[PDB]
Amino acid sequence: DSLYDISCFAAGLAGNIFALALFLSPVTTFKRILKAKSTERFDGLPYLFSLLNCLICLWYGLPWVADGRLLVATVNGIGAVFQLAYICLFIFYADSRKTRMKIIGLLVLVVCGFALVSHASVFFFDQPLRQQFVGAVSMASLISMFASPLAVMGVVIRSESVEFMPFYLSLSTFLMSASFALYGLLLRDFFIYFPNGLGLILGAMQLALYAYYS
Amino acid sequence: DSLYDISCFAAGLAGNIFALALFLSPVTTFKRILKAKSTERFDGLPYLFSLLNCLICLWYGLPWVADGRLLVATVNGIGAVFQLAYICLFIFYADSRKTRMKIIGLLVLVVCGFALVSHASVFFFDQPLRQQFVGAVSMASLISMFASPLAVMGVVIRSESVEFMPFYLSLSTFLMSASFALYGLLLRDFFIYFPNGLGLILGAMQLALYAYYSSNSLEV
Amino acid sequence: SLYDISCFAAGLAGNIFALALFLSPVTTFKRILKAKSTERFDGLPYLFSLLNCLICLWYGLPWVADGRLLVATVNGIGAVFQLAYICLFIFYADSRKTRMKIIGLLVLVVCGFALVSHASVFFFDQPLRQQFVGAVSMASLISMFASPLAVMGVVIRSESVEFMPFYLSLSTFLMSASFALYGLLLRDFFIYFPNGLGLILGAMQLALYAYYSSN
Numbered sequence: 005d006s007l008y009d010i011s012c013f014a015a016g017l018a019g020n021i022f023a024l025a026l027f028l029s030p031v032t033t034f035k036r037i038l039k040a041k042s043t044e045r046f047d048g049l050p051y052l053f054s055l056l057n058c059l060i061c062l063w064y065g066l067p068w069v070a071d072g073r074l075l076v077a078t079v080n081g082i083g084a085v086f087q088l089a090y091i092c093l094f095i096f097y098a099d100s101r102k103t104r105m106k107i108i109g110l111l112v113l114v115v116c117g118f119a120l121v122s123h124a125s126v127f128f129f130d131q132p133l134r135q136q137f138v139g140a141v142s143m144a145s146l147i148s149m150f151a152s153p154l155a156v157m158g159v160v161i162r163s164e165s166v167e168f169m170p171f172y173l174s175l176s177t178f179l180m181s182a183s184f185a186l187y188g189l190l191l192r193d194f195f196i197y198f199p200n201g202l203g204l205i206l207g208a209m210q211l212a213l214y215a216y217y218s
Numbered sequence: 219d220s221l222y223d224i225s226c227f228a229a230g231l232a233g234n235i236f237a238l239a240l241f242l243s244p245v246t247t248f249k250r251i252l253k254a255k256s257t258e259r260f261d262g263l264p265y266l267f268s269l270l271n272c273l274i275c276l277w278y279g280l281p282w283v284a285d286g287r288l289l290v291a292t293v294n295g296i297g298a299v300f301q302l303a304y305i306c307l308f309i310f311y312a313d314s315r316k317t318r319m320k321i322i323g324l325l326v327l328v329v330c331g332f333a334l335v336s337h338a339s340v341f342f343f344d345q346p347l348r349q350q351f352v353g354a355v356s357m358a359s360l361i362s363m364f365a366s367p368l369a370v371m372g373v374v375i376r377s378e379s380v381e382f383m384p385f386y387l388s389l390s391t392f393l394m395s396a397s398f399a400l401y402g403l404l405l406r407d408f409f410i411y412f413p414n415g416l417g418l419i420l421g422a423m424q425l426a427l428y429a430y431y432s433s434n435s436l437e438v
Numbered sequence: 439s440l441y442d443i444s445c446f447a448a449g450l451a452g453n454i455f456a457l458a459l460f461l462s463p464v465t466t467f468k469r470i471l472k473a474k475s476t477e478r479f480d481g482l483p484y485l486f487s488l489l490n491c492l493i494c495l496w497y498g499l500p501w502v503a504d505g506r507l508l509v510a511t512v513n514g515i516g517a518v519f520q521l522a523y524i525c526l527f528i529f530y531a532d533s534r535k536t537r538m539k540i541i542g543l544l545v546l547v548v549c550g551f552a553l554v555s556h557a558s559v560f561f562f563d564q565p566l567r568q569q570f571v572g573a574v575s576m577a578s579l580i581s582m583f584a585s586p587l588a589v590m591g592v593v594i595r596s597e598s599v600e601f602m603p604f605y606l607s608l609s610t611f612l613m614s615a616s617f618a619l620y621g622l623l624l625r626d627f628f629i630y631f632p633n634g635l636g637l638i639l640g641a642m643q644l645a646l647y648a649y650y651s652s653n
């Protein structure tokens with residue numbers, strides 16, 4: 005009765021915290037940027053990607069696009085802020101006109117691209133199609149993000165070292181995916197569960213792979 | 219059929235008029251191939267890609283696939299002819315057996331691919347799904363086209379030159395996108411509007427850079 | 439009556455021709471067998487082929503889609519091969535890392551498949567379930583066409599037919615021609631379109647070989 009509603013609240017809230025560590029992770033890399041006050045070692049795009057991904061999922065969270073999936077709006081809303089901050093700092097601490105011009109442009113594309121689809125979903129669609137369209141787009145967007153953790157695992161093995169795959173980040177993320185998969189499961193929302201379920205698996209292999217290497 | 223009915227025609231036509239410049243654009247690049255009679259310098263794939271895009275959108279244009287959206291059929295039908303001509307000139311002038319043959323297989327592939335999907339849809343589907351299916355396929359095709367303008371935008375930034383991004387082409391495409399995005403908006407057609415909307419943003423994005431690099435050029 | 443048996447014929451033809459495609463990597467594998475090492479080889483396709491065979495297997499089962507039993511049979515056969523091929527690949531390998539990169543991917547495939555296989559039955563009810571799985575399988579199937587196409591490109595560059603056997607392509611082509619036919623009668627887009635897409639490639643494969651055989 006009252007319990008189920010608190011439980012949905014619990015699963016989402018668990019994720020919103022666990023997500024924070026992941027959001028936090030660029031800062032350690034970012035300090036190295038703050039060092040030498042140059043961006044030479046890394047570009048620099050993923051933040052642009054993460055922001056776009058957060059924006060679309062944020063849209064999904066809003067009550068008109070999907071209802072009772074509001075906790076999801078909060079986490080990406082937090083995340084969109086995180087990615088937005090990283091980029092703004094990235095722009096300031098940039099090496100050359102060329103990086104600065106490139107990142108600014110992509111930010112324009114991301115903001116405009118998101119604006120166009122976010123408007124289009126509400127303008128051109130009436131529920132229940134609007135949810136599945138945003139839900140489909142948001143989900144596809146999320147799975148694409150799995151490319152980076154998959155890549156990091158690939159790096160870890162060949163290198164034979166876990167230096168770049170921190171245990172703290174990997175665990176919090178596994179659990180984050182886990183909370184959300186349950187949350188998706190409770191509303192019987194395919195769009196929340198399936199991508200988050202896939203992330204969990206990736207998180208699971210990451211921990212297991214980590215342990216052997218330790 | 220009323221007042222708004224004139225407007226849609228206008229937008230479709232306007233888009234239809236702006237589209238040719240994009241269609242014509244390879245010819246200036248193309249003219250060099252013909253002299254010295256070789257393609258060694260240029261491959262050569264995009265014309266094949268553009269054609270496949272034009273057929274699918276063309277098919278969407280047709281009345282059985284979609285109703286009241288023939289202008290789309292016209293613009294792509296026009297484009298497909300340009301692309302087919304571009305391909306054929308490219309075929310004869312292809313340098314080496316491998317270039318000429320590879321294109322033939324791809325060209326064989328494109329027409330076969332299109333015939334199969336165009337048949338499958340009319341055969342396997344009853345409206346409104348057919349419209350939705352083709353529009354979905356048509357739209358996905360159109361966004362892929364966007365890969366090329368994004369890259370040239372990338373080169374301009376690296377080059378710090380507007381040499382490869384002519385203003386005439388940028389404006390024309392921007393207008394084609396605006397016209398077609400507007401056209402889609404009027405009919406409440408997501409399939410036409412959205413990529414064109416996406417294309418408009420790219421077009422706008424291109425105009426902004428040219429203004430910056432042309433203004434910040436050495437000559438000024 | 440007459441047609442029902444006809445369904446069995448087209449599916450059977452495909453189920454038989456599949457073994458030839460499934461068998462074809464064995465010849466490259468024998469080379470793996472001598473010296474028990476994979477230095478030349480990184481075998482992503484066996485991991486790729488298994489996952490595709492798995493998903494279509496799901497589409498084949500009666501609760502997922504009904505009367506789609508032959509497709510269930512053929513990939514179920516196929517998945518084991520890929521399952522078998524992966525196993526020989528793991529024990530005989532160059533370094534722990536070649537083995538280890540692959541081990542994880544196999545975990546992903548089984549977990550990935552289980553997750554999607556379960557998710558479908560849990561979150562979806564007919565007629566959507568058939569539509570969802572058929573789509574995932576279909577998209578998966580069309581992706582497989584990438585390898586034969588590249589080989590076509592190779593034939594052109596090489597000016598040689600060494601990298602694609604003539605016997606292999608027709609057997610593949612006949613399966614593609616037969617299975618596309620299997621899909622059409624039940625009016626199943628999901629079976630027909632990709633398989634129809636495959637035969638076309640198959641036709642291209644045969645024609646190129648014929649060209650090179652002549653001159």
Ligand SMILES: CCCCCCCCCO[C@@H]1O[C@H](CO)[C@@H](O)[C@H](O)[C@H]1O
Nearest residue numbers: 147148149150151152153154155156158
């Ligand atoms: C020789 C290079 C072989 C692939 C390189 C491995 C690391 C690349 C990250 O993986 C990516 O995962 C995504 C979904 O998980 C996919 O969008 C994408 O297709 C895939 O590339």
